[PDB]
């Protein structure tokens, strides 16, 4: 169909419009991701902002959008950042694949970090979100 209606409202530029467009956006991101991709700059900007109220939902959407493109690490950054709305004791096929990718990423940092100091492990000193 079209996500062009939903996105029109995102550009109106207030709190209510951000939240409605977000909660709509979560449901059918995956099929309509194409259209949404162009507004991915607004979504990331909302991300590390809070002039609106949608941040953790914005990170969530962005993860879903990134996913559908084929940028898994990019999606992974934002899935983490979605924080309280992202949970690994809840599984969909989507969830399985980015937890998998989050471990790979963690593996990569850990190879490098062992060689560097062999008690890296005795503290967090790597990304907290990953560790969690």
């Amino acid at each position: 169909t079209t996500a062009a209606p939903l996105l029109a409202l995102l550009r109106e530029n207030q709190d209510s419009v951000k939240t409605y467009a977000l909660e709509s956006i979560n449901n059918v991101v995956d099929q309509l991701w194409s259209e949404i991709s162009n507004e991915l700059p607004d979504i990331e900007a909302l991300y590390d902002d809070d002039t609106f109220s949608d941040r953790e939902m914005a990170a969530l959407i962005a993860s879903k959008v990134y996913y559908n493109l084929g940028e898994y690490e990019s999606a992974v950054k934002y899935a983490l950042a979605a924080k309280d709305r992202f949970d690994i004791d809840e599984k969909s096929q989507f969830v399985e694949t980015i937890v998998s990718k989050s471990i790979e990423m963690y593996v990569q940092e850990a190879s490098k970090q062992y060689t560097k100091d062999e008690q890296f492990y005795t503290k967090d000193i790597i990304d907290p979100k990953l560790t969690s």
Binding site: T1, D30, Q31, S34, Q93, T97
Partner: protein
């Protein structure tokens, strides 16, 4: 238990093929049951292996009857049915692999792409184009031809004539299997004929005599003559008469896009010629095209690349070069680069076989 579950899946597939037009009475009456067998995650349930015992062509036939506002009969006016189905096919793509299981993969992208072409936008199209490209050794001859058929239509809209020209020619090659001697061949043929006209002109119909009905052949002859004579009046009339065909294909835009080529072709036929060219002689030629805009049309011609010529309007005479002599324009170099690609690419696949 195991053997019985595989058997269970064969029986649902089988049932689903039977209850169509193919092997049973009328597809529309039957549609609701065909839809019950798909829907409540029995399609899902099929994941013993990949979808390649049921095919995109089949999912196409059930879904079109359900919904298209002309077979449904404006049954509903919403694409609620397709939105769930497109999502579910999208959901399959994620868990699909590309390296050795792209039998399910190409088929799902075919069904999704199709729906955009039926009703959607040419904007979102770009992502679907890039996703599609996956080996053409995994899918049947029938399935390869359909994949090319849809890809070629999509490429035409973007005005990539050349790419579609290659895919279409490959598409309709041989016939070890059906829908390359049937109705599907005629649909391909019409779209190929259109793409060549778009490039410049089609002036061969030798193949088409034998693989298309008489009703198609007449409109093919009328178009090629209009475009070759350059005559706009015959071309316009050809669209006017075969209005029913252009509507049918669902692409009345072609008429709008091609008409511009005809007026361009007319200006070309009589080349640049002599070193100075008289206004009158050219005026006569442009008068045919449009006769109260001699100076504007000739100006438009130069900017466009129909012609290149140099003008004085304080003398009102046209100056030209006439070039029929083909010195090097990177032309050996181009040959070599192309050949190293041609030899390697061909070479590797042939070697694997």
């Amino acid at each position: 238990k195991t053997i019985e579950v595989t058997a269970e899946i064969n029986c649902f597939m089988h049932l689903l093929v039977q209850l169509f037009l193919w092997d049973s009475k009328e597809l529309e009456q039957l549609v609701e049951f065909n839809r019950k067998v798909v829907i409540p995650n029995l399609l899902c349930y099929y994941n013993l292996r990949s979808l390649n015992l049921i095919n995109a062509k089949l999912w196409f036939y059930i879904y079109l009857s359900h919904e298209t506002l002309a077979r449904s009969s404006e049954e509903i006016n919403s694409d609620n049915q397709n939105i769930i189905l497109r999502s579910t096919m999208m959901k399959f793509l994620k868990i699909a692999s590309l390296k050795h299981d792209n039998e399910t993969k190409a088929m799902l992208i075919n069904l999704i792409l199709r729906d955009f072409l039926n009703n959607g936008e040419v904007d979102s199209a770009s992502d679907f184009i890039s996703k599609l490209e996956y080996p053409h050794t995994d899918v049947s001859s029938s399935l390869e031809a359909r994949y090319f058929f849809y890809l070629s239509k999509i490429n035409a809209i973007q005005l990539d004539y050349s790419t579609a020209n290659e895919y279409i020619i490959a598409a309709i090659r041989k016939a070890p299997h059906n829908s390359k001697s049937l109705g599907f061949l005629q649909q391909s043929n019409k779209l190929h004929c259109c793409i060549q006209l778009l490039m410049g002109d089609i002036p061969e119909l030798s193949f088409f005599h034998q693989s298309n009905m008489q009703k198609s052949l007449l409109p093919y002859y009328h178009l090629t003559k209009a475009v070759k004579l350059g005559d706009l009046k015959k071309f316009t009339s050809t669209i006017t008469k075969y209005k029913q065909l252009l509507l049918k294909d669902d692409t009345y835009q072609l008429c709008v896009r091609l008409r511009s080529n005809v007026i361009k072709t007319g200006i070309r036929i009589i080349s640049l010629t002599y070193k100075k060219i008289s206004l009158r002689d050219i005026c006569l030629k442009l008068n045919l095209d449009s006769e109260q805009t001699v100076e504007y049309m000739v100006s438009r011609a130069i900017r466009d690349g129909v012609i290149e010529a140099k003008i004085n309007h304080e003398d009102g005479f046209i100056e030209t070069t006439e070039l029929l002599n083909i010195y090097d324009s990177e032309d050996p170099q181009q040959v070599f680069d192309e050949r190293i690609k041609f030899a390697n690419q061909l070479h590797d696949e042939y070697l694997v076989s």
